A paper describes a structure:
pmcAlcohol dehydrogenases (ADHs EC 1.1.1.1) are NAD(P)H‐dependent medium‐chain oxidoreductases found in all kingdoms of life. These enzymes typically catalyse the reversible reduction of aldehydes or ketones to the corresponding alcohol.
We also report the structure of the ADH geissoschizine synthase (GS) that catalyses an atypical 1,2‐iminium reduction. GS catalyses the irreversible 1,2‐iminium reduction of strictosidine aglycone to form geissoschizine, another intermediate in vinblastine biosynthesis. GS and THAS (47.7 % and 53.8 % amino acid identity to DPAS respectively) each crystallised with both the catalytic and structural zinc ions bound. Additionally, GS and THAS each had mutations in highly conserved residues involved in the proton relay observed in canonical ADH reduction. Although THAS Glu59 is positioned 3.6 Å from the 2′O of bound‐NADP+, GS Glu56 is positioned 7.6 Å from this moiety which is not consistent with a role for this residue in cofactor binding or catalysis.
Author numbering:
A (entry chain B): 8 to 129, 134 to 363
B (entry chain A): 9 to 129, 132 to 361
């Protein structure tokens, strides 16, 4: 009896970054392992850049996927969390050292030795844009019954990235006024989380066309175009926090600091592109802070999903077949999707 | 009503030529404390303010945010201070008293602070503590601990509070923490001494190789590194819970300070802003690191800081001078030729 787990995934074989199918094996499920039939895989800006090795974290062959939703088809004998049939998800990590202070305190995303699903080096692994995953139960998330997997799968990226810093800073309280720069996947979900927390959300966007969806769909309290200097001046000193989802350096730090109240925080989550110019005087005079954040701990992933489910929050998602992946990447780059693609792996990814 | 006849030192205009300035203080109201000034600290801030370096200076200008003296009179409703008590006044003599910051004891972040030296941070016209007498609302008067000398201690009102406040806010005032300190002057040296007394570890990064001995032997630093020693700094990557930057803003690379931090580390900027920092986002994001600024402290923090310094016998290295040396002292302050602060003996030399 051949036990091996045959898999196929999409990514790049070479540094050229040309998208291709990649055949490989998953390990046989150990006693604590969960074998997952992948139903949906999110794709985002991060994946699009990783395939071209924008940041030097990519090892080839490279199968992307840090946004994975599926169903349990097999469990190891000592698995307690999940049974066959259960809907589950996997985020950016499939392992950590488990003995460092970060791991002990539930911040596995800041383990010095993370085991990334897509194998990014910042074990040799293949990501969730594949037919099947085998993952230790610790790193598998329970999927809430009331969330659809197709529209929800992007929460694993869009959701956790914004939820984690807001919780860390204690901004997830009623009454807080939070500004959000850039209304894409992260931006839109941030607005929806802020409203559900009982806060007030202001959107600053480069796209005037997004006013309607910001106000009418996401429930933002205000929408401001980034070039509207007089309106931005008027919002000086009004925000408990600012969430910057724009590429690092594309929004002036001086603007973001000026919008903050005393003790306010700028939360940088966007991909670094260029240096910020940082004036010290606003930080010092206002005891303001700038903080960065990447993904979230395992607990935060689960809490985020449970929260989204409670308030019926999803990410605006376009569901596509695997054969459209090349075009999807182009649309991601051109900011021509509202706001994320989800790949229907379960129905469209096939062998040979 | 005006009453108390007063003399202070400062400048009449932007030339910054030091002179005596004659004025009157108000009669103590019911909540006021009249203070005979015994010592006044002077520092970089004062030296620059007299020349209006930053445009905050209103003339005539009598500096002094580091004032220690004794109570000679109190208003009828003051109970906390009695005649004869040793006291101090810091940078503020008033605030709006009704904003969230004021209510939560962070008067230094009131939108409408009343500065001792009258610097426009609006704000009421005032003359600072480099004067023979002060009249101050009891709320803004500090109790001076008996076991600290006023002459060597008065600089704590500036050097001490500025570094103590952010470390407390960030929870860095705990045993085991490793804190880096850029610039070993008044703030730097006192920071080291606080860090050690908190039970932490202090590394000093300085531009002056000659300060190695005093850093280790006098202040109790665990390590000393020259700022141009790239290889040593590389080796300290990822070791520090916090970095205190006392250098002028923009003089220390932000990339260096971020690189020195551990996961969840904080950069604390307290130095006078001079030029923009270049901020790379990647270290912040990857390490969940933070950059914060801080200015002076709340009234409670001033008092806690003094009480703490007293408990551990912490003072600032101070050169005590007469008022007639003030012109030369300003020059030495600018040339970084004092270890590390001047205190003026007002009580005995200002007539
Ligand atoms: N920290 C983490 O853990 C983490 C994890 C995943 C992703 N990220 C990063 O988070 C960022 C946002 O993710 P996303 O999926 O929402 O990205 P996205 O769809 O590529 O862009 C989000 C929005 O940012 C604004 N924007 C994009 N490019 C811009 C530019 N050059 N100048 C100014 N504004 C620009 C646009 O908003 P408007 O149309 O409103 O102007 C756009 O809709 C990306 O940089 C991504 O790499 C970070
Ligand atoms: N945030 C606040 O509330 C507040 C309040 C008062 C003062 N301050 C500011 O805090 C800073 C420190 O005060 P201080 O009285 O300790 O200052 P200082 O005696 O003028 O300078 C302190 C030390 O900083 C270093 N330094 C000075 N100029 C430098 C330069 N151009 N480049 C690099 N390093 C330089 C030197 O250390 P090394 O010899 O070791 O290199 C010097 O001994 C000043 O900028 C002061 O204005 C802030
Ligand atoms: Zn670990
Ligand atoms: Zn993603
Ligand atoms: Zn106030
Ligand atoms: Zn001072």
């Amino acid at each position: 009896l051949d036990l091996s787990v045959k898999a196929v995934g999409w990514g790049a074989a070479d540094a050229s970054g040309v998208l291709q199918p990649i055949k490989f094996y998953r390990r046989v499920p150990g006693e604590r392992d969960v074998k997952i039939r992948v139903l949906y895989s999110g794709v985002c800006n991060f994946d699009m850049e990783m395939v071209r090795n924008k940041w030097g974290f990519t090892r080839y062959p490279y199968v992307f996927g840090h946004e994975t939703a599926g169903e349990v088809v097999e469990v190891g004998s000592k698995v307690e969390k999940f049974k066959v049939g259960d809907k589950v998800a996997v985020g950016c990590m499939v392992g950590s050292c488990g003995q460092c202070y970060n791991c002990q305190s539930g911040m596995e995303n800041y383990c010095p030795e993370p085991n990334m699903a897509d194998g990014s080096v910042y074990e040799r692994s293949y990501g969730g844009c594949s037919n099947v995953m085998v993952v230790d139960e610790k790193f598998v998330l329970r999927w809430p019954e009331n969330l659809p997997q197709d529209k929800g799968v992007a929460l694993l990226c869009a959701g956790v990235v914004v939820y984690s810093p807001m919780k860390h800073l204690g901004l997830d309280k009623p009454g807080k006024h939070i500004g959000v720069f850039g209304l894409g996947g992260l931006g839109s979900v941030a607005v929806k989380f802020i409203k559900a927390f009982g806060g007030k959300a202001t959107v600053i966007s480069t796209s005037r066309r997004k006013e309607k969806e910001a106000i009418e769909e996401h429930g933002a309290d205000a929408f401001v175009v980034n070039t509207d200097s007089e309106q931005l001046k008027a919002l000086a000193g009004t925000m408990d926090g600012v969430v910057d989802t724009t590429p690092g350096g594309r929004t002036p730090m001086s603007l973001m600091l000026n919008l903050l109240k005393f003790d306010g925080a700028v939360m940088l989550v966007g991909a670094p592109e260029s240096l910020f110019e940082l004036p010290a005087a606003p930080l010092i005079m206002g005891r303001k802070k700038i903080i960065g954040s990447s993904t979230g701990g395992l607990k935060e992933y689960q809490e985020m999903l449970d929260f989204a489910a409670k308030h019926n929050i999803v990410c605006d998602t376009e569901v596509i077949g695997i054969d459209y992946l090349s075009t999807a990447m182009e649309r991601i780059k051109n900011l021509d999707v509202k706001y994320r693609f989800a790949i229907d792996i379960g129905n469209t990814l096939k062998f040979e």
